Design a protein around this ligand. Structure first.
Ligand SMILES: Nc1ncnc2c1ncn2[C@@H]1O[C@H](COP(=O)(O)OP(=O)(O)OP(=O)(O)O)[C@@H](O)[C@H]1O
Ligand SMILES: Nc1ncnc2c1ncn2[C@@H]1O[C@H](COP(=O)(O)OP(=O)(O)O)[C@@H](O)[C@H]1O
Ligand SMILES: Nc1ncnc2c1ncn2[C@@H]1O[C@H](COP(=O)(O)OP(=O)(O)O)[C@@H](O)[C@H]1O
Lengths: 369, 370, 370
């Protein structure tokens, strides 16, 4: 036979992979930066035209597998991986590129959550999905996704950068190159994100309480962890601002919004034949949330919100576990789909062909078949 | 030599002749899971059944395949059958004659269809189907006795005399604990508890059997309960919820004595049984007081024997000495009686072979099954 | 005192009130919870943001709205305290609890604790001299003038069918499933979730409600209409969000008649409906099939009555035609029935005197609850 394609829907990254590939292959930022491009073109560009994006997709895929491995994908199948909430018109436009332009043998939609389950291959599990812009707790009991148990916090990595630029735009505690306090307006997002991503260690809960105390009417924020700068302007200021981001990450201040909040929501839709199972199933996943030392703040907030009076009746006294990931950073769904597409020659029949797409041109989601 | 298979809309059992414990014991309910529209991988069985469905009860919805004898689908019933055979014994049906049961009020076309498919699908050498009550008194040790069946969805009073009996004398009301499960679930819903799926039914039937004791007069019991709420016992479910009920417990089986709880335009179990006794001989009725035999799986509740005793005690004269036969194993006793029935060679000379339907058709079902 | 008594009405989505003689409830106040979105940085503000009508239309910054009675299932009461308190405040009717007797209704299938808490408020905190609690469909019947008829209606989050002849109804024959418009709003936003739009809080929920009751209809052939093609008209928000919808603009019967296709466990209005009708007297059932009181404050879409007719045709004993009843607006009929109710001799034999409440309370509440 041959290998296959393994690509997921990532606002920041859409890696490619083969069938049963053991080990990562190549990660590239989802935006498309071309010749004479002042600012690269993203992927999450909805209610935008289809021909320009169509073209971008064509040449980007073109050079993508070129500089990946220069393979001829008109020979092997594709494993499409989803990320819900995206308009199907967009997804089908991708399909339009694939089949009506490149004519690959067959393609096949798939859920990222499935591959995450495939990392352990068990039947029932919680979903600790933490994507790039939103999160999702849509458990997979018996290897089956739990429909109404959904929710998403539009405050992911991109919004985290927005928070960073907000905080640092408020105070330029760096020097000239004498301090240049908010002199210019544009920011080096790559540098900002380098500082951010290269310094993401989560702090203690007590430290977050100190931040809360600093909100209204402070105990030693340094030794502060934040990564060097450039542009002849480097500094050593409070890196505790990232912990402030961790605090605003979970807001109960007349908002009551957190990850545990969605777990509670799931619990509300959960029936008794799901509760203890999920208490066992303390699935530990999440894409952009690669947060170092987040177990502390995380677990503490979990076992901090268990004590909520309106939720002890719902919870009782439920203990949890740590369903450790054998995979890596975000390779979870990537390699999950890789090995998942390995011997799925059987499911190659389930992989939508261009043949049927000629006379069809449509793939149905929850619609009238 | 044989193939003993006790049946039931819930409890379906199996084994062979001479065996004392039923090899097959499982809920004969059909589980149908939440087949949704989005994609999924690695699959599952189309519809798990009973224990198979109970294993994954969170999606599987064990709806009833039978309804007081009204089998919904024969196909699903056969799926239950086939898998149960190739689940418990894994033996082919051509080995020995089968043994199954049924009860009256059933249109003859059902038992005909039943046996018809039993020869179709299975091609057994011979076969046989009977009445549970026969095995009940048969395992009891009498040829003269009145019993009553209280299964999951059945109720029937059978008076026997030296083996002889009368269909006019044998009365029947196919109503049982399932109705009580509905009543109990809705009243606990009134108490403030959510109940939507079939798992709700399972948990409530569970605790239902765990708490349906039998007191005497709900007026004074209710007065004591409202007085002292100590009887209102607590119980914590698999989920953190812990309910407290005291009346509910024993007052749920009071509907058996009173259709008023459901408004059924019917009579109490005691007076119904009394009328069954009334359709007899003045001498043999006395023997019914002597042969006060009790059966039914939904009669595993303590206190009702004394209740029913007191009922008829108020009904019948003092000279009518009550002698209640109360076996606490009546549930499995039918299967056991089937094994004992499968042990008497003469009965095993009497059969329902292939050629009978092949030539005779299904009329021999009417004159041979019983 | 012989003043005009206060007639408070209810509602999971739209709650009303009035007096015995009002022909119009002066306020079409919805059932919700005004709150802050964030911790107000400065103390001494609009405490809890208890906003009503224009006060709710005043600002939107720290303003998170909720429901204090989810789908009829009320959980907390502090919101209710402030809501009722606002009504008691001299901006609604400018009267007192003591100045006028109070009439009120209650939704069925509820624990007694709700009644307990409410009466505790009305007599402890506020002081009603004579109160009452009734149903809703009865009042709608009085508004329609019928005293018989298969009553049917559906609120904002509660649906219920009650078979009635001269007011008589069997509790067994009475059916009710509490799921309506609120979840339809939840699914409208879920449709747009698939379409990728703004999803952060209750503001969008309000928007979607305006869509649901404004930029939404119901078709008749979802398979055909799904396979058809439109250009999907848009709307303009305060931002002017020109957003297209399509099938999702009318994908509601897959929640009304087919909610199970959302991997859910339900039946369908018509099913439960017909079942409840089937619980009655077959011939009286047939007669009442010609007079089926149809209502519903959320069932405000064209063509859906035809879809119901299709369900009827699939379920009625064919050639016994039952055409479409198309009552467009269904809200104040209950309020009207309550006004007519308290306006008659009714409340004189049907009040709840504060004195009797002081003597017994829940005892009196339930001894006079029927
Ligand atoms: N151990 C028990 N204690 C109390 N009640 C029981 C027990 N076992 C069964 N029951 C009652 O019996 C019913 C379950 O069905 P049962 O055990 O009578 O077999 P069955 O399937 O009814 O047999 P058939 O259908 O042929 O009568 C339920 O209504 C349940 O309340
Ligand atoms: N130690 C870390 N802590 C938190 N986040 C990290 C860490 N290391 C990398 N990341 C972030 O995880 C992100 C993965 O994003 P991803 O979920 O792949 O976005 P998308 O799904 O849109 O492709 C990377 O953008 C990276 O910035
Ligand atoms: N045009 C419409 N389409 C769908 N639903 C509507 C429409 N108009 C009102 N509704 C919903 O129906 C409800 C009215 O039903 P009603 O019987 O008044 O219940 P409630 O008293 O709980 O509001 C309103 O609360 C509203 O949310």
């Amino acid at each position: 036979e041959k290998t296959a394609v393994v690509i997921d829907l990532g606002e920041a990254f859409t890696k490619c992979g083969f069938a049963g590939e053991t080990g990562p292959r190549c990660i590239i930022p989802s935006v498309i930066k071309k010749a004479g491009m002042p600012k690269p073109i993203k992927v999450v560009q909805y209610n935008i035209n289809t021909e320009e994006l169509y073209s971008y997709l064509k040449e980007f895929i073109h050079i993508l597998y070129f500089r990946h491995l220069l393979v001829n994908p008109r020979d092997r199948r594709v494993v499409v991986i989803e990320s819900v909430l995206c308009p199907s018109h967009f997804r089908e436009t991708l399909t339009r590129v694939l089949f009506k332009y490149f004519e690959v043998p067959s393609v096949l939609l798939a859920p990222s959550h499935l591959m995450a389950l495939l990392t352990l291959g068990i039947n029932s599990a919680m979903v600790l999905d933490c994507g790039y812009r939103e999160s999702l707790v849509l458990p997979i009991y018996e290897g089956i996704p739990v429909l109404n148990c959904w929710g998403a916090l539009p405050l992911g990595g991109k919004a985290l950068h927005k928070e960073l630029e907000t905080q640092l735009l408020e105070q330029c505690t760096v020097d000239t190159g004498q301090s240049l306090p908010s002199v210019m307006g544009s920011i080096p997002e790559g540098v900002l994100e380098d500082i951010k991503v290269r310094t993401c260690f989560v702090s203690d809960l007590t430290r977050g309480l100190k931040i809360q105390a600093a909100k209204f009417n402070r105990p030693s924020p340094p030794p502060n962890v934040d990564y060097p700068l450039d542009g002849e302007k480097i500094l050593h200021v409070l890196g505790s601002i990232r912990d402030s981001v961790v605090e605003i990450l979970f807001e109960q201040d007349n908002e009551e919004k957190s990850v545990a909040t969605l777990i509670l929501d799931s619990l509300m839709q959960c029936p008794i034949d799901t509760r203890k199972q999920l208490a066992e199933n303390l699935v530990i996943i999440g894409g952009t949330s690669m947060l170092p030392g987040f177990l502390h703040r995380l677990l503490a907030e979990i076992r901090y919100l268990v004590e909520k009076p309106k939720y002890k009746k719902t919870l009782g006294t439920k203990t949890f576990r740590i369903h450790t990931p054998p995979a890596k950073a975000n390779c979870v769904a990537w390699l999950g789909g890789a090995i998942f597409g390995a011997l799925q020659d059987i499911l190659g029949s389930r992989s939508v062909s261009k043949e049927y797409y000629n006379q069809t041109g449509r793939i149905p989601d929850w619609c009238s078949l | 030599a044989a193939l003993v298979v006790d049946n039931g809309s819930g409890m379906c059992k199996a084994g062979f002749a001479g065996d004392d414990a039923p090899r097959a014991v499982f809920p004969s309910i059909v589980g149908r899971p939440r087949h949704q529209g989005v994609m999924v991988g690695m699959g599952q069985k189309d519809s798990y059944v009973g224990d198979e469905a109970q294993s994954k009860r969170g999606i599987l919805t064990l709806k009833y395949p039978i309804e007081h004898g009204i089998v919904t689908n024969w196909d699903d019933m056969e799926k239950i059958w086939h898998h149960t055979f190739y689940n418990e014994l894994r033996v082919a049906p051509e080995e020995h004659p089968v043994l199954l049961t049924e009860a009256p009020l059933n249109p003859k076309a059902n038992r005909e269809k039943m046996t018809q498919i039993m020869f179709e699908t299975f091609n057994t050498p011979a076969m046989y189907v009977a009445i549970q009550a026969v095995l009940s008194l048969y395992a009891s040790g009498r040829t003269t006795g009145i019993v009553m069946d209280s299964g999951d969805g059945v109720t029937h009073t059978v008076p026997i005399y030296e083996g002889y009996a009368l269909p006019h004398a044998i009365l029947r009301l196919d109503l049982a604990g399932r109705d009580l499960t509905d009543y109990l679930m809705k009243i606990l819903t009134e108490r403030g508890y959510s109940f939507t799926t079939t798992a709700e039914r399972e948990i409530v039937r569970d605790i239902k059997e765990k708490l349906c004791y039998v007191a005497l007069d709900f007026e004074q019991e209710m007065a004591t309960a409202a007085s002292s709420s100590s009887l209102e016992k607590s119980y914590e479910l698999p989920d953190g919820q812990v309910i407290t009920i005291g009346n509910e417990r024993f007052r749920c089986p009071e509907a058996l004595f009173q259709p008023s709880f459901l408004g059924m335009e019917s009579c109490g179990i005691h007076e119904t049984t009394f009328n069954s006794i009334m359709k007899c001989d003045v001498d043999i009725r006395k023997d019914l007081y002597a042969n006060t035999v009790l059966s039914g799986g939904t009669t595993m509740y303590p206190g009702i024997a004394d209740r029913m005793q007191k009922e008829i005690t108020a009904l019948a004269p003092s000279t009518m000495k009550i002698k209640i036969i109360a076996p606490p194993e009546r549930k499995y006793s039918v299967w056991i009686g089937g094994s004992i029935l499968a042990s008497l060679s003469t009965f095993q000379q009497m059969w329902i072979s292939k050629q009978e339907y092949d030539e005779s058709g299904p009329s021999i079902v009417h004159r041979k099954c019983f | 005192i012989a003043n005009q008594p206060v007639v408070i009405d209810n509602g999971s989505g739209v709650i009303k009130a009035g007096f015995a003689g009002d022909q119009i409830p002066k306020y079409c106040f919805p059932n919700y919870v005004g709150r802050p979105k964030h911790v107000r940085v400065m103390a001494g503000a609009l405490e809890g943001d208890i906003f009503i009508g224009p006060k709710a239309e005043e600002h939107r910054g720290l303003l998170s709205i909720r429901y204090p009675m989810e789908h009829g299932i009320v959980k907390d009461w502090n919101d209710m305290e402030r809501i009722w308190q606002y009504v008691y405040s001299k901006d609604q009717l400018q009267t007192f609890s003591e100045e006028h007797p109070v009439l009120l209704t209650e939704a069925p299938l509820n624990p007694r604790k709700n009644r307990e808490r409410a009466a505790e408020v009305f007599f402890e905190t506020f002081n009603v001299p004579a109160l009452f609690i009734s149903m809703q469909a009865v009042l709608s019947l009085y508004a329609t003038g019928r005293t018989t008829g298969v009553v049917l209606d559906s609120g904002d989050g509660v649906t219920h069918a009650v078979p009635i002849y001269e007011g008589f109804a069997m509790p067994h024959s009475i059916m009710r499933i509490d799921i309506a418009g609120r979840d339809v709003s939840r699914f409208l936003r879920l449709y747009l979730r698939k379409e990728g739009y703004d999803f952060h809080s209750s503001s969008e929920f309000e928007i979607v409600k305006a869509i649901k009751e404004r930029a939404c209809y119901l078709s008749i052939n979802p398979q055909k209409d799904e396979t058809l093609e439109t250009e999907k008209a848009q709307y303009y928000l305060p931002d002017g969000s020109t957003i297209e919808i399509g099938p999702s603009r009318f994908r509601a019967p897959e929640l009304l008649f087919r909610p199970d296709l959302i991997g859910e466990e339900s039946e369908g209005i018509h099913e439960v409906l017909v079942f409840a009708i089937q619980k009655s007297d077959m011939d009286l059932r047939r007669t009442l099939f010609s007079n089926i009181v149809l209502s519903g404050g959320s069932t405000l879409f064209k063509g859906f009555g035809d879809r119901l007719l299709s369900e009827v045709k699939k379920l009625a004993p064919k050639d016994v035609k039952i055409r479409i009843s198309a009552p467009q607006e269904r809200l104040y009929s209950t309020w009207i029935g309550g006004s007519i109710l308290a306006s008659l001799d009714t409340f004189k034999k049907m009040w709840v005197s504060k004195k009797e409440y002081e003597e017994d309370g829940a005892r009196s509440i339930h001894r006079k609850t029927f």
